[PDB]
């Protein structure tokens, strides 16, 4: 909901015109099992949801934003670095699961189309290629294990290539 | 021994014959042909000529040696259940059974206890009888049979008694 | 909504005996019957979603038990119910359904009667995981799980010698097949961030490294092939329902099953198309040749699977996944019958596993012999004996291609070669005069046998009516060459059987003919016990014993610290034992020490 | 000559003068130790300890990050063009060379 | 009838009985663990208001035993 | 190892020296069997028998390491080339693959766009 | 919270009466191990320090829980031994385990390198007394001297290494302060700075060269089999390789390149010998070389994926090899010899222990995701990003991983046992409990392996 895109709406409607037979085996079993134990499971779930009554709201998500970036404070000192290093590790842990959502968007496209596969969608394909390429350059993926102090050197390496190539042309 | 080496090859030749031929009536035809070949040299005893034929017997047989021979059922080595189907349980595990469970079916436990008491008493008499045999080294080839009739049990008692049941 | 709910029921029903395995409730003698009753209702619950698939519906489900959150990944227990996965479930369940009630008759009155059923359920569960696998990590659970449960089943009979060689080799040759499969994992993760099977259909990369050294190398380990196949005749050493499952529906599909699911990769790559058929060309005749010379009831059927696997490899090489699964589904019904109806002979005439000694006539046994005739002819190209609906569709499609000509010609000889070993069950053992294995041998039909074989006949006859008609196909192959391509599939079975009957009767009915000793037979075993049972285990152990252990791991790699002990003790002896007392000698050394500090060392 | 070296003897509890036990000597010590407190650790560390492991107390932002990511996706999609990653923790750096 | 092959059995079967007796003894909180989801409510997804950040449990979703 | 003809019953003669040779083999075979017979067929034992031949078999690999190897000769140096040698073999394999990879990252990109894992 | 109740185990064993001892030492240790899982697991984005620098928090160490898991288990299998001798001797060699447990907690908890070093070598002292006494076979001293003169010869260069860093670059201390560290310029003078930090951990984590430290410690058995579990703890006790390579030398990986190649050949040659060997304990001793060699490969790559497999394998091997040694001890207490060929017979004589033999053997291979599939496979996946050639060598090793396990099974799965008359009772209630307490914790890690691999997970 909200964040996940997916398809808008599915059609799914049966006609059944050819052959009389015993109506349909798929339709008869669907109507029978809906009231057999599926209706009892819906009644038991409603009985437990109503039994809760009082519920705590709770904060759930925590704030804490910015508090000075790592590429603003320099020189080896524990008082300034510790707040900056916690900020970068917060962003890195979230960006690991940002890609996961975009990856699941591509997972949703594969099943819903099936036969089309790569012929349609295109929006999820373009969104995945843009993020992963940016994730490869900015958030390590090449510069060893995670470190906030080494990240500034990784950003400087990409900035040096932009300054050298543009000056020639 | 010359006699044993001929019999060992002849026993192998008959069982190796049924791998090449399919039907039992055709097997009997070739069996009579093999008898006529060996009876020609069996009539006279030789020290040089008969030993030359023994080494010659390895040839022709080795030319058609591997058509995957039949061992039939449970045979020493070969194919199709050599040690399989018979998992078995050792006699040492029988006495190892704990109480309460040992109380169930008392006919098997009481009869085994009587045989165990007889085996314990005969063990002292069997040890003196085994060293009584004239060799004065340890043993010669095979184990010697019992001479005494009153004491019974020929050397080993647990060799034949309690083995395996399929 | 009903599709998602009923799909998990089939998974839960098979785990219910395992849930009641750990004590729970006492069940004496009823535990072998409890497995039969659990799978009986599992078939009915699996029939409905397949009937829904013919109508309308396709659903993918996850249990939300994602154990991985590591670096842009989610790995839940995914269950795919789509085409190749959906249709295979009721086919595999109906095959087992007969084998479980067969397991009541065979292996009866054993101390480990309950434990035998325990591993067979796990052998069914691990396969069902591999079938419904939508994650590549989920795919490993099935592909290794079936290969690891086979150890307990092939080496089930507790033999001191020879029995454990087969169980060792079953995983040993499988783990050389793993080299590709684990390489297929590592390439998939590095090149594609998604890791799951839902990626390949969009933004498909054109690389030869992935399927060749990967899925094809996995297809050589699992499911026979040419690469490594000495584990097939050795697997016959175990009990007969075990050898039935490994070569009909379970272990025999695992190699091919991966290649069908990875169908967009095979179509795009041209180099993969050739190598799948070039390796598939050697699988067709070389393994079929071994079925002729080897004369054992079980071992003929063991090599017949690998000859059938050649056609299963051609389907991947021809780029037709739709006709790929159709052959294996019908193959499941072919050898569920053929393995244990022939296995019924072994138990009847004492304990004989040879075709030469066996003489089970058609008049002597009425029920078992009828299945042997139908089952053998079903493998060959027969118009309505479920052979035409599986085997003949591949042969007609193969002729119209830009693919290799030598691979196409080699498959045509193998299709006619099927008639030889199928008649070598009938003419060699069943037909003619009985060989008489033992004096006074009892053979009788049991109530458990009648309920199993007769209900297998429905699956072996109606397979070309239900599976072929209901499944939606893509692109019709039959169009060109009425005599060169279309007729050649049926004529090979007719000319092959006539050649088999003329060759077998000439040696059997001759009386005086004399068999020739000198022959050019590279056919007895295919010379694989000479290189992979004689040379390959020796070369890995000679480098372990002549080298490694007797040179490095005990002497040379140790020689770092004993090197600084043998030289250290020599330096130790030059101070303690040196200078045998005497104040004279110690004071003579003090003369030099002052001269070192003044002349040799520059300080004042 | 060994003099006093010969003293080695085979010893096993098994079942003789023990009935059924795990601890060496005394039936009273055996039951209270080998079956009670031996299996009390089997009940507290294994059964009651299964509730913890990783399930319940969040465990290093595994469940927290999912709720945090989803609200950041919907906010950045409506206003901005670039999705999440574009320039990670870099805004006006004092040159390079 | 035969005496057959004998094993120890008495020592073997007792251990499995002694193991399972202490699984069942702490199998009661396993049974309570099911009813904790049944009787008491687990968690609901809702936006937090600026009043209290943490009380008893700071941030815990699913299962009352987690809090 | 196998020859042109498999050894099983090839080349056998009765003679006089060979007849006494089989008598020598049975003399030790029966001697070691009877001491096993005296140990197996009594209920008073209860335990695992030692057997001096089997202990010396385990002692052959676990011990007798440094009492041996005192004649090194040229055989030991050949074993060193089969041990320390293959370690130097991969040094010209892994480095050549890495130098192939490192050149691609800087100029003419070969790495996939949909790559993020490690 | 962790230290102090562990120290109170020392007066517990001495004050208690002669009839008890073993009941108090095992029961009280189990409730301390429960409380370790209760508090240590809680962490934020970056794991925040516990208190003052004496014993600190865990950042990527769920391996402390394993030490707490063996804390009672190092007493269960040692019950068969020590019982024949004096009551004062019993109390002494329980307290030597308590001292081991005291120092082993201190190594993993304390986020340091200077004070960590004097706890790193401090574990060697109680194990030395443990190995040099109670050894049933001879050459205790030809294994006891080799136990120190391999480790201390490599670890004493840390005094000239670690102190040299803190004298130039700030101070080592907290590691959370360690961001002063500048990348190494890579010169001929900087070669011996890197080697001295590595060679200390190159011994405890066995390679191809200088690996003979481990088999001598295992074959020559200290006490029964419970002390061999502490020898497994020493392998994973050199965990500082996770900390040094990441922090102290981040730019230095060019000098790591020859050391990976050494450990890569310490996979084929170490496995080949682990096939034709006679001793049952030795066939676990050489398989433990190759299993821990996988970790050394993963560390020197320095990729974020490899540390996940590295941290997993430390816990994976710590409860699978120790499980295998308990099975080796269970045959050593009955047959009285460590020979594989002589001690032959499962299922027929050992009906329920044979299922524990199967579960322990198959865990060495890649089973359904317990811990070793999350351990081994993660390293193999990470090696391809290093170089494409690796899996050609690593795949061959995956064949021989079966050849440790199945060869140990088959050579015991023959139901002959003609020479053997002993082993009447299959297993005591404690002996079967040992086997369950090793596999069932790994079976609980199937549901959630987050507390099995966590360096930024």
Name the closest residue on chain C to residue B27, using Cα atoms: C511
Name the closest residue on chain A to residue G48, using Cα atoms: A86
Name the closest residue on chain C to residue A140, using Cα atoms: C71
CA proximity to A82, closest of G176, D75, B41: G176
Distance, in angstroms, between G19 CA and closest chain B CA?
27
What φ, ψ does residue C79 adopt, rounded to 5°? -125, 115
Residues 6 or more apart whose Cβ sits within 8 Å of residue G129: G96
C193 chain-F contacts, CB cut-off 8 A? 114-117
**Can you spell out the DSSP letters for A70-97?**
TTT--SS-HHHHHHHHHHHHHHHHHHHH
CA proximity to C232, closest of C305, C160, C179: C305
Please, what's the b/e burial string for F48-63 (b: 16 or more CB within 10 A of its CB; e: otherwise)?
bbeeeebeeebeebbe
CA proximity to G230, closest of G102, G402, G393, G89: G102
The Cα–Cα gap between B133 and B140 comes to: 10
Contact flag G341-F57 (C-beta cutoff 8 Å): yes
Residue G80 near residue G87, CB atoms below 8 Å? no
The Cα–Cα gap between C380 and C399 comes to: 19
Q: Judged by CB atoms within 8 Å, which residues 37-96 of D form the interface with E?
A: 39-40, 42-44, 46-48, 51, 55-58, 63-64, 67
For residue C59, list its beta bridge partners: C81
Angle formed by the axes of helices G372-386 and G304-335, to 10°? 140
Q: Is C215 helix (H, G, I), strand (E, B) or coil?
A: helix
- CA-CA-CA-CA dihedral for G321, G323, G325, G329, to nearest 10: 180
Instruction: Write the residue in E8, E18, E19 that is nearest to G426 by C-beta.
Output: E8
B67 chain-C contacts, CB cut-off 8 A? 293, 295, 524
Instruction: Write the residue in D65, D85, D90 that is nearest to A97 by C-beta.
Output: D65
**What is the number of H-type helices and E-type strands within chain F?**
5, 0
- Cβ neighbours of C16 (radius 10 Å): 14
CA proximity to G435, closest of C117, D42, C155, A72: D42
Q: Is C168 helix (H, G, I), strand (E, B) or coil?
A: helix
Specify the residue for token string 């690389």: C207
The Cα–Cα gap between G119 and G109 comes to: 11
Contact flag D20-E14 (C-beta cutoff 8 Å): yes
G44 chain-E contacts, CB cut-off 8 A? none
CA proximity to F38, closest of G415, C429, C347, B129: B129
Instruction: Write the residue in F57, F97, F118 that is nearest to G389 by C-beta.
Output: F97
Q: Which one of A98, A133, A158 would you mutate to disrupt binding with F, by most F Cβ within 10 Å of its Cβ?
A: A133
Distance, in angstroms, between C316 CA and closest chain A CA?
19
Residue C561 near residue G154, CB atoms below 8 Å? no
Distances (CA, A) of G305 to G44, G207, G238, G455, G456: 20, 22, 20, 9, 10
For residue C81, list its beta bridge partners: C59
CA proximity to G300, closest of G194, G405, G395: G194
The Cα–Cα gap between G442 and C98 comes to: 37
Distance, in angstroms, between G360 CA and closest chain D CA?
19
Distances (CA, A) of F59 to F54, G331, G339: 9, 19, 10
Q: Do D and G touch (≥3 CB pairs < 8 Å)?
A: yes
Q: Do E and A touch (≥3 CB pairs < 8 Å)?
A: yes
C-alpha angle C331-C332-C335 in degrees, rounded to nearest 5: 80
Contact flag C73-A100 (C-beta cutoff 8 Å): yes
Q: Do E and D touch (≥3 CB pairs < 8 Å)?
A: yes
* The token pair that represents B142 in the structure block: 């095979």
Long-range contact pairs involving B12-20 (C-beta distance under 8 Å, separation at least 24): B13/B61, B15/B69, B15/B70, B16/B61, B16/B65, B16/B69, B18/B70, B18/C356, B19/B67, B19/B68, B19/B69, B19/B70, B19/C295, B19/C356, B20/B64, B20/B67, B20/C515
Residue C276 near residue C216, CB atoms below 8 Å? yes
Q: Do G and C touch (≥3 CB pairs < 8 Å)?
A: yes
Residue B82 near residue C157, CB atoms below 8 Å? no
Residue G238 near residue G201, CB atoms below 8 Å? yes
DSSP G408: H
Distances (CA, A) of B97 to B118, C76, C543, E9, G357: 21, 48, 47, 6, 23
Please, what's the b/e burial string for B101-119 (b: 16 or more CB within 10 A of its CB; e: otherwise)?
ebeeeeebbeebeeeeeeb
DSSP D27: H
What φ, ψ does residue C326 adopt, rounded to 5°? -65, -35
Name the closest residue on chain B to residue F48, using Cα atoms: B92
- Report the half-sphere exposure of G420 (CA within 13 A, side-chain side): 26
The Cα–Cα gap between C132 and F28 comes to: 64
E55 chain-A contacts, CB cut-off 8 A? 58
The Cα–Cα gap between C523 and C292 comes to: 8
Distance, in angstroms, between A152 CA and closest chain D CA?
9
Gaps in chain B after residue (C–N beyond 2.5 Å) = none
Contact flag E15-G352 (C-beta cutoff 8 Å): yes
Instruction: Write the residue in G351, G424, G429 that is nearest to E14 by C-beta.
Output: G429
C-alpha angle A15-A17-A21 in degrees, rounded to nearest 5: 115
The Cα–Cα gap between G166 and G197 comes to: 14
- Cβ neighbours of C31 (radius 10 Å): 17
What's the N-to-C CA distance of chain A in angstroms? 47
The Cα–Cα gap between C465 and C456 comes to: 15
For chain B, what is the HEC assignment? CHHHHHHHHHHHHHHHHHHHCCCHHHHHHHHHHHHHHHHHHHCCCCCCHHHHHHHHCCCCCCCCCCCCCCCCCCCCCCCCCCCCCCCCCCCHHHHCCCCCCCCCCHHHHHHHHHHHHHHHHHHHHHHHHHCCCCCCCCCCCCCCCCCCCCCCCCCCCCCCCCCCCC
The Cα–Cα gap between G27 and G72 comes to: 8
Q: Which chains touch C (3 or more CB pairs under 8 A)?
A: A, B, F, G
Q: Which one of G341, G387, G453 would you mutate to disrupt binding with F, by most F Cβ within 10 Å of its Cβ?
A: G387
Residue C504 near residue C428, CB atoms below 8 Å? yes
B93 chain-E contacts, CB cut-off 8 A? 5-8
Q: Is C537 on the interface with F (CB under 8 A)?
A: no
- Cβ neighbours of G168 (radius 10 Å): 9
H or E stretch covering C80: strand C78-81
Contact flag G425-E18 (C-beta cutoff 8 Å): no
Q: Report how far Cα C408 is from the mean position of its chain's Cα atoms.
A: 25
* The token pair that represents C369 in the structure block: 């012999």
The Cα–Cα gap between E40 and E67 comes to: 12
Distance, in angstroms, between D16 CA and closest chain B CA?
10
Contact flag B90-E6 (C-beta cutoff 8 Å): yes
Contact flag F116-A128 (C-beta cutoff 8 Å): no
Contact flag D73-A91 (C-beta cutoff 8 Å): no
* The token pair that represents C504 in the structure block: 């077998």
CA proximity to G452, closest of G374, G392, G390: G374
Q: Is G33 on the interface with D (CB under 8 A)?
A: yes
A58 chain-E contacts, CB cut-off 8 A? 46, 48, 55, 57, 59
Residues 6 or more apart whose Cβ sits within 8 Å of residue G305: C71, F117, F118, G378, G381, G382, G385
Specify the residue for token string 């006089």: F16
Q: Is C6 on the interface with F (CB under 8 A)?
A: no
Specify the residue for token string 């965990």: G239
Residues 6 or more apart whose Cβ sits within 8 Å of residue G287: G271, G274, G321, G364, G404
Distances (CA, A) of F50 to B92, B159, C581: 18, 20, 53
Instruction: Write the residue in D48, D56, D58 that is nearest to E26 by C-beta.
Output: D48
Sign, Cα dihedral of G132, G135, G140, G145: negative
Distances (CA, A) of C334 to A131, B73, C378, C451: 51, 28, 7, 18
Please state the length of chain B.
166
Provide the phi-psi class of B64: left if phi over 0, else alpha when psi is between -120 and 50, else beta: beta
* The token pair that represents G230 in the structure block: 């502490």
Residue G120 near residue G112, CB atoms below 8 Å? no
CA proximity to C519, closest of C507, C505, C501: C507
Distance, in angstroms, between B129 CA and closest chain C CA?
35
Name the closest residue on chain F to residue A140, using Cα atoms: F118
What φ, ψ does residue C60 adopt, rounded to 5°? -115, 130
The Cα–Cα gap between C451 and B157 comes to: 50
The Cα–Cα gap between G239 and G311 comes to: 9
Q: Judged by CB atoms within 8 Å, which residues 106-135 of C form the interface with B?
A: 111-112
Q: Report how far Cα F99 is from the mean position of its chain's Cα atoms.
A: 39
Contact flag G179-A85 (C-beta cutoff 8 Å): yes
Sign, Cα dihedral of G410, G413, G414, G420: positive
DSSP C211: I
Name the closest residue on chain D to residue G47, using Cα atoms: D60
Distance, in angstroms, between G416 CA and closest chain C CA?
7
* Resolution number, Å: 5.6
Considering only CB atoms, which residues of chain F are within 8 Å of chain B?
Answer: 5, 9-14, 26-27, 30-31, 33-35, 37-38, 40-44
Contact flag G348-B88 (C-beta cutoff 8 Å): yes
Please, what's the b/e burial string for C511-534 (b: 16 or more CB within 10 A of its CB; e: otherwise)?
eeeeeeeeeeeeebbbebeeebee
Residue G102 near residue G49, CB atoms below 8 Å? no
Q: Which one of C113, C233, C351, C513 would you mutate to disrupt binding with B, by most B Cβ within 10 Å of its Cβ?
A: C351
């Amino acid at each position: 909901x909200x964040x996940x895109x997916x398809x808008x709406x599915x059609x799914x409607x049966x006609x059944x015109x050819x052959x009389x037979x015993x109506x349909x085996x798929x339709x008869x079993x669907x109507x029978x099992x809906x009231x057999x134990x599926x209706x009892x499971x819906x009644x038991x779930x409603x009985x437990x949801x109503x039994x809760x009554x009082x519920x705590x709201x709770x904060x759930x998500x925590x704030x804490x934003x910015x508090x000075x970036x790592x590429x603003x404070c320099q020189e080896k000192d524990v008082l300034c670095m510790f707040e900056a290093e916690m900020q970068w590790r917060r962003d890195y842990k979230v960006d690991q699961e940002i890609v996961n959502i975009i990856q699941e968007r591509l997972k949703a496209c594969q099943q819903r189309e099936g036969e089309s596969h790569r012929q349609n969608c295109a929006k999820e394909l373009e969104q995945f290629t843009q993020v992963v390429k940016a994730y490869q350059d900015r958030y390590x993926x090449x510069x060893x294990x995670x470190x906030x102090x080494x990240x500034x050197x990784x950003x400087x390496x990409x900035x040096x290539x932009x300054x050298x190539x543009x000056x020639x042309x | 021994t010359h006699q044993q080496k001929v019999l060992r090859l002849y026993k192998r030749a008959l069982r190796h014959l049924e791998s090449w031929c399919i039907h039992r009536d055709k097997y009997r035809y070739f069996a009579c042909l093999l008898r006529a070949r060996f009876d020609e040299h069996k009539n006279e005893k030789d020290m040089v000529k008969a030993t030359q034929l023994l080494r010659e017997a390895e040839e022709e047989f080795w030319h058609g040696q591997h058509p995957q021979p039949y061992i039939f059922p449970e045979s020493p080595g070969g194919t199709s259940y050599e040690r399989y189907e018979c998992y078995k349980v050792p006699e040492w595990c029988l006495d190892d059974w704990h109480p309460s469970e040992k109380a169930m079916y008392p006919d098997y436990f009481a009869k085994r206890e009587q045989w165990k008491k007889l085996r314990r008493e005969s063990w002292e008499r069997e040890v003196x009888x085994x060293x009584x045999x004239x060799x004065x080294x340890x043993x010669x080839x095979x184990x010697x049979x019992x001479x005494x009739x009153x004491x019974x049990x020929x050397x080993x008692x647990x060799x034949x008694x309690x083995x395996x049941x399929x | 909504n009903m599709f998602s709910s009923l799909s998990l029921v089939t998974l839960l029903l098979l785990t219910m005996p395992i849930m009641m395995m750990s004590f729970n409730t006492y069940k004496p003698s009823n535990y072998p019957l409890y497995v039969k009753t659990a799978i009986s209702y599992a078939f009915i619950t699996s029939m409905i979603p397949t009937m829904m698939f013919i109508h309308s519906g396709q659903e993918l489900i996850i249990s939300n038990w994602h154990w991985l959150t590591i670096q842009t990944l989610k790995l839940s227990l995914s269950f795919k119910m789509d085409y190749f996965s959906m249709m295979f479930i009721p086919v595999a369940l109906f095959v087992t359904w007969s084998i479980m009630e067969f397991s009541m008759w065979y292996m009866y009155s054993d101390p480990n009667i309950n434990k035998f059923f325990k591993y067979l359920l796990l052998f069914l569960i691990t396969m069902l995981i591999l079938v419904t696998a939508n994650n590549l990590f989920q795919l490993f659970i099935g592909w290794e799980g079936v290969g690891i449960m086979s150890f307990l089943l092939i080496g089930w009979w507790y033999g001191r010698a020879d029995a454990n060689t087969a169980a060792l080799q079953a995983i040993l040759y499988n783990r050389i097949g793993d080299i590709g499969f684990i390489l297929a994992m590592a390439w998939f993760l590095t090149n594609l961030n998604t890791w799951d099977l839902q990626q390949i259909f969009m933004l498909n990369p054109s690389d030869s490294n992935m399927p060749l050294i990967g899925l094809a190398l996995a297809a050589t380990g699992k499911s026979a092939q040419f690469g490594l196949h000495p584990w097939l005749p050795s697997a016959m050493e175990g009990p007969t329902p075990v050898s039935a499952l490994l070569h009909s529906s379970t272990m025999v599909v695992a190699g091919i099953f991966l290649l069908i699911r990875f169908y967009p990769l095979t179509e795009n790559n041209k180099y993969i198309q050739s190598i799948t058929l070039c390796l598939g060309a050697i699988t067709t005749l070389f393994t079929a040749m071994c079925a002729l010379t080897q004369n054992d009831i079980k071992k003929i059927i063991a090599f017949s699977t690998s000859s059938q696997l050649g056609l299963m490899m051609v389907t991947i090489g021809i780029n037709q996944p739709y006709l790929a699964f159709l052959h294996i589904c019908t193959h499941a019904f072919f050898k569920a019958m053929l393995f244990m109806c022939s296995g019924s002979i072994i138990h009847s005439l004492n304990d004989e596993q040879d075709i030469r000694k066996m003489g089970g006539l058609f008049k002597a046994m009425p029920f078992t012999t009828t299945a042997l005739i139908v089952g053998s002819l079903a493998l060959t190209g027969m118009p309505f004996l479920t052979g035409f609906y599986s085997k003949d569709l591949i042969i007609e499609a193969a002729n119209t291609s830009y693919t290799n000509a030598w691979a196409l010609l080699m498959t045509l000889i193998a299709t006619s070669f099927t008639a030889i070993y199928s008649t070598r069950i009938i003419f060699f053992a069943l037909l003619g005069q009985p060989r008489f294995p033992t004096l006074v041998n009892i053979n009788e039909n049991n109530p458990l046998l009648i309920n199993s074989i007769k209900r297998l006949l429905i699956g072996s006859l109606f397979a070309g009516y239900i599976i072929s008609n209901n499944i939606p196909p893509t692109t019709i192959p039959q169009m060109t060459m009425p005599y060169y391509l279309k007729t050649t599939a049926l004529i090979v079975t007719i000319l092959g059987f006539i050649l088999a009957l003329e060759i077998s009767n000439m040696t059997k009915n001759l009386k005086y003919h004399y068999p020739s000793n000198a022959f050019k037979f590279s056919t007895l075993l295919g010379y694989f016990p000479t290189i992979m049972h004689r040379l390959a285990p020796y070369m890995n152990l000679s480098m372990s014993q002549k080298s490694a252990s007797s040179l490095l791991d005990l002497i040379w790699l140790e020689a770092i610290l004993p090197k600084t002990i043998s030289l250290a003790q020599m330096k130790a002896s030059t101070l303690v034992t040196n200078q045998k007392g005497l104040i004279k000698l110690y004071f003579l050394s003090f003369l030099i020490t002052i001269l070192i500090s003044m002349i040799l060392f520059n300080f004042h | 000559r060994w003099q006093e070296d010969p003293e080695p003897e085979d010893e096993n509890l098994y079942e003789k003068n023990p009935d059924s036990h795990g601890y060496d000597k005394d039936p009273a010590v055996d039951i209270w130790n080998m079956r009670v407190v031996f299996f009390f650790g089997f009940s507290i560390v294994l059964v009651l300890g299964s509730t913890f492991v990783a399930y319940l107390p969040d465990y290093r932002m595994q469940e927290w990050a999912r709720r945090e990511a989803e609200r950041l996706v919907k906010y950045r999609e409506a206003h901005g063009l670039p999705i999440m990653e574009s320039n990670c923790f870099d805004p006006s750096k004092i040159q390079l060379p | 009838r035969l005496f057959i092959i004998k094993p120890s059995g008495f020592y073997d079967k007792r251990f499995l009985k002694l193991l399972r007796f202490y699984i069942l003894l702490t199998g009661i909180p396993v049974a309570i663990g099911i009813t904790l989801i049944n009787v008491x409510x687990x968690x609901x997804x809702x936006x937090x208001x600026x009043x209290x950040x943490x009380x008893x449990x700071x941030x815990x979703x699913x299962x009352x035993x987690x809090x | 190892x196998x020859x042109x003809x498999x050894x099983x019953x090839x080349x056998x003669x009765x003679x006089x020296x060979x007849x006494x040779x089989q008598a020598e083999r049975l003399a030790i075979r029966s001697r070691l069997k009877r001491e096993y017979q005296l140990q197996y067929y009594d209920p008073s034992r209860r335990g695992v028998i030692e057997d001096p031949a089997l202990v010396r078999w385990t002692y052959a690999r676990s011990a007798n390491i440094y009492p041996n190897f005192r004649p090194n000769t040229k055989t030991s140096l050949l074993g060193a080339l089969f041990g320390i040698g293959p370690l130097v073999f991969w040094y010209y394999v892994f480095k050549t693959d890495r130098d192939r990879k490192e050149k691609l990252i800087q100029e003419g990109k070969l790495d996939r766009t949909f790559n993020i894992s490690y | 919270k962790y230290i102090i109740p562990t120290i109170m185990l020392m007066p517990l064993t001495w004050l208690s009466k002669n009839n008890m001892i073993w009941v108090n030492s095992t029961a009280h240790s189990l409730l301390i191990s429960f409380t370790s899982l209760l508090l240590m697991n809680q962490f934020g984005d970056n794991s925040l320090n516990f208190s003052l620098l004496f014993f600190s928090d865990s950042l990527s160490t769920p391996l402390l829980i394993l030490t707490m898991w063996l804390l009672p288990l190092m007493l269960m299998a040692s019950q068969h031994h020590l019982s024949k001798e004096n009551l004062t001797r019993k109390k002494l060699f329980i307290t030597m385990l308590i001292s081991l447990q005291l120092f082993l907690i201190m190594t993993f908890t304390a986020m340091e390198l200077i004070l960590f070093y004097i706890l790193f070598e401090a574990t060697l002292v109680p194990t030395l007394i443990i190995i040099t006494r109670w050894g049933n076979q001879t050459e205790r001293l030809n294994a006891g001297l080799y136990f120190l003169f391999y480790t201390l010869a490599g670890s004493l260069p840390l005094l000239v290494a670690l102190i040299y860093i803190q004298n130039t670059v700030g101070s080592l201390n907290f590691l959370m302060l360690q961001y002063w560290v500048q990348p190494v310029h890579n010169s001929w003078s900087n070669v011996f700075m890197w080697l001295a930090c590595m060679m200390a951990f190159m011994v405890k984590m066995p390679l191809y060269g200088l690996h003979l430290w481990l088999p001598k410690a295992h074959v020559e058995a200290p006490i029964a089999g419970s002390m061999v579990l502490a020898a497994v703890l020493l392998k994973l006790g050199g965990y500082g390789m996770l900390r040094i390579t990441l922090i102290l030398n981040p730019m230095t990986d060019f000098m790591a390149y020859p050391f990976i190649m050494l450990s890569l050949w310490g996979m084929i040659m170490t496995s080949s010998i682990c096939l034709r060997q006679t001793d049952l304990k030795s066939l676990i001793a050489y398989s433990s070389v190759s299993h821990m060699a996988l970790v050394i490969v993963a560390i020197l790559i320095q990729t974020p994926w490899s540390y996940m497999g590295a941290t997993a394998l430390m816990i994976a091997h710590g409860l699978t090899s120790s499980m295998l040694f308990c099975l080796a001890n269970s045959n050593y207490e009955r047959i009285h010899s460590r020979t594989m060929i002589l001690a032959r017979g499962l299922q027929t004589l050992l009906p329920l222990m044979a299922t524990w033999w199967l579960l322990a053997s198959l865990t060495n291979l890649a089973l359904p995701p317990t811990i070793n599939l999350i351990g081994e496979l993660f390293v193999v996946m990470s090696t391809f990003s290093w170089s494409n050639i690796t899996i050609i060598l690593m795949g061959v090793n995956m064949v021989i991983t079966a050849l440790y396990s199945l060869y140990m099974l088959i050579m015991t799965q023959r139901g002959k046992y003609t020479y053997h008359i002993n082993n009447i009772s299959p297993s005591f209630t404690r002996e079967n409990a040992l086997m369950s307490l090793h596999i069932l914790p790994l079976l609980l890690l199937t549901l959630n392996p987050k507390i099995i691999l966590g360096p930024l997970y």
